[PDB]
Structure formats: structure tokens, C-alpha cells
């Protein structure tokens, strides 16, 4: 996360920290006790489910947050229509199961996030939040030890397709979001994480961090998987 602020898991209780056996891989979001949703490009190079570890209720990258839960990946579902270069259908599902053979157990540091209703997204200009352990600066080598979050505004497909933006690289299955001053944004390491918006009432997983040209660059918004356009897929796989 470029700019923004530090936070603890209490402020984004559905955030899942995904690692590979051990280094960090990507963020994710708990949509149900047994299911975490993320981005396929995060695991494409290592599709083997047994190579991953998922944590819930974790606020620190390399330290065990008090109250956290650790899970193995019982099923790593990548999207069969995924394609790259811009990422298409960048969505993935991880069915979690602890060594005790149980799914997530809700708590003050672990809760689920509601999915959007079919094709129901906030109006462009709406402020939403993004969370992750990604770089705080494009030139950084290290990722922050403390979870971060920030606010970005939804950009219409109209605007995002403009010349100076992404033109045709962005599709209707993607959502663009950025800061009006381009001073804050998601970055390397934030992929798979949540783009949460208050949809007239409740916090809703409107998007999943997917891709972007650089980070916090003028006319280069963050691009997110448009969750409200993947409900059939999520439904059929859960």
C-alpha cells in the first residue's frame, strides 16, 4: 500500500494473509468460514495446494498476531479462464482447513465479508478501502511488517479506458480505483487483497486487487477484479 495508514486486523477482520512454504504471497478475503477468495495470478506459478499456508486474524507479516488462526489449503481453485497480459479473470478460491480439521472460527479478529449482489457496484467516485502487506514505495525491496490500508475512489470504465489511462487493457469485468491526487494506491504484494465498499448499508467485497501500471502513478489507476461479475463462478465452486 502506497501512502495510507497502518492498521491491525481488527479493522479488516476478513483479511487473509497467504504464504508459501516460508514467504508471503498475497492477500485474500474470508467470504465464508471455509472459504477465502483471492487472485489466481498469485498462485499460477505454484498451483500445488499443499505449498500454502493461510492465516486469519494476523496483523504482522513475520510475527504471530495474538489470536490468529493457521490453515492448510484443502482446495486451491484457480479460474480456468485466467489469462495474462493486465490479468483476466484474476480470481481464486482457497478452501481452508486447520490441522484439527476445522474451518475459520469467527472472533473479534476474524469475520467474513459480504459479497456484492449480481452486477451491483457503487457509483463511480465512491470511496472504498484496500488492505494489504504490499510495498509502501515502488522502489522498496521489503514489504511492511505491519498491515496497511488506504482509501481510493472508484473510476468509471469510461474514464479508465481513456487514452492516457489503460485504454483497451481494462474490461467490464475489471474495476479501476485511484486517488484523485494519485498519492495512495495498492502495489506489489497487495494482489489478492480486498477492495471494500459500503454498498448503501454494508461493507461489501466489491473488488480484489489485481494489477496496475506501476503504483500511485498519474493516470494509472489500480485495477481490481469486479466481484459482482463473478458470482456464478463463486457459487458453482463453493
Spatial distance between the Cα atoms of 221 and 177, rounded to a whole number of angstroms = 5
d(C-alpha 31, C-alpha 149), whole Å:
19
- β strands within the chain, DSSP E: 5-6, 15-20, 23-32, 35-38, 52-56, 69-78, 83-84, 87-88, 92-97, 127-132, 148-155, 174-178, 194-199, 202-211, 222-226
Distance CA 41, CA 50 (A): 17
Of 110, 130, 112, 113, give the one whose Cα is nearest residue 55: 110
Out of 2.120.10.60, 2.40.10.10, 2.60.120.560, 2.60.40.1220, select the CATH number for domain 13-112+229-238.
2.40.10.10
Is residue 156 classed as helix, strand or coil in its secondary structure?
A: coil
Residues in the chain: 238
Contacts of 37 (CB under 8 A, 6+ apart): 28, 29, 31, 91, 92, 93, 94, 205, 208, 227, 234
Residue showing cell 467516485 = 125
For residue 31, the SS3 value is strand
Q: How far apart are CA 37 and CA 194, in angstroms?
A: 9
Query: Do the strands 5-6 and 148-155 form a parallel or antiparallel pair, or are they unpaired?
Result: antiparallel
Which class would CATH give 1-12+113-228? Answer: mainly beta
Q: Cell for 194?
A: 480486498
Q: Tell me the C-alpha distance between 230 and 61, whole Å.
A: 29
Residue 75 · residue 48 · CB < 8 Å: no
Residue 63 C-alpha cell reads as 510475527
Q: Are 55 and 67 in contact (CB under 8 A)?
A: no
Looking at residue 3, what DSSP letter applies?
S
Q: Are strands 15-20 and 5-6 parallel, antiparallel or unpaired?
A: unpaired
For CATH 2.40.10.10, the residue range(s) in the chain are 1-12+113-228, 13-112+229-238
Residue 237, SS3 per DSSP: helix
- Per the CB < 8 A criterion, the answer to whether 196 and 227 are in contact is no
DSSP state of 220: B
The total of other beta-carbon atoms located within 10 Å of residue 16's CB is 28
Residue 236 has a CB neighbour count (10 Å cut-off) of: 7
The resolution, in Å, is 1.7
Three-class SS state of 157: helix
| Torsion of Cα atoms, 51 then 10 then 185 then 175, to 10° | 80
Cα angle 152, 85, 40; round to 5: 70
- Spatial contact of 53 and 47, defined as CB atoms under 8 Å apart: no
Strand partners, 61: none
The single-letter DSSP state of residue 215 is S
Q: What is d(CA 87, CA 26) in angstroms, rounded to the nearest whole number?
A: 15
Amino acid at each position: 500500500i502506497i501512502g495510507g495508514e497502518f492498521t491491525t486486523i481488527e479493522n479488516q477482520p476478513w483479511f487473509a494473509a497467504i504464504y508459501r512454504r516460508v514467504t508471503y504471497v498475497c492477500g485474500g478475503s474470508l467470504i465464508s468460514p471455509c472459504w477465502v477468495i483471492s487472485a489466481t495470478h498469485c498462485f499460477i506459478d505454484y498451483p500445488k495446494k499443499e505449498d500454502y499456508i493461510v492465516y486469519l486474524g494476523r496483523s504482522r507479516l513475520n510475527s504471530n498476531t495474538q489470536g490468529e488462526m493457521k490453515f492448510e489449503v484443502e482446495n486451491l481453485i484457480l479460474h480456468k479462464d485466467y489469462s495474462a497480459d493486465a490479468h483476466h479473470n484474476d480470481i481464486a478460491l482457497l478452501k481452508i482447513r486447520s490441522k484439527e480439521g476445522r474451518c475459520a472460527q469467527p472472533s473479534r479478529t476474524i469475520q467474513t465479508i459480504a459479497l456484492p449482489s449480481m452486477y451491483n457496484d457503487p457509483q463511480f467516485g465512491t470511496s472504498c478501502e484496500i488492505t494489504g502487506f504490499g510495498k509502501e514505495q515502488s522502489t522498496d525491496y521489503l514489504y511492511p511488517e505491519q498491515l496497511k490500508m488506504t482509501v481510493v475512489k472508484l473510476i468509471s470504465h469510461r474514464e479508465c479506458q481513456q487514452p492516457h489511462y489503460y485504454g483497451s487493457e481494462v474490461t467490464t469485468k475489471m474495476l479501476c480505483a485511484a486517488d484523485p491526487q494519485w498519492k495512495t494506491d495498492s502495489c506489489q504484494g497487495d494482489a489478492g487483497g480486498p477492495l471494500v465498499c459500503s454498498l448503501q448499508g454494508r461493507m461489501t467485497l466489491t473488488g480484489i486487487v489485481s494489477w496496475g501500471r506501476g503504483c500511485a502513478l498519474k493516470d494509472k489507476p489500480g485495477v481490481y477484479t469486479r466481484v459482482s461479475h463473478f458470482l456464478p463462478w463463486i457459487r458453482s465452486h463453493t
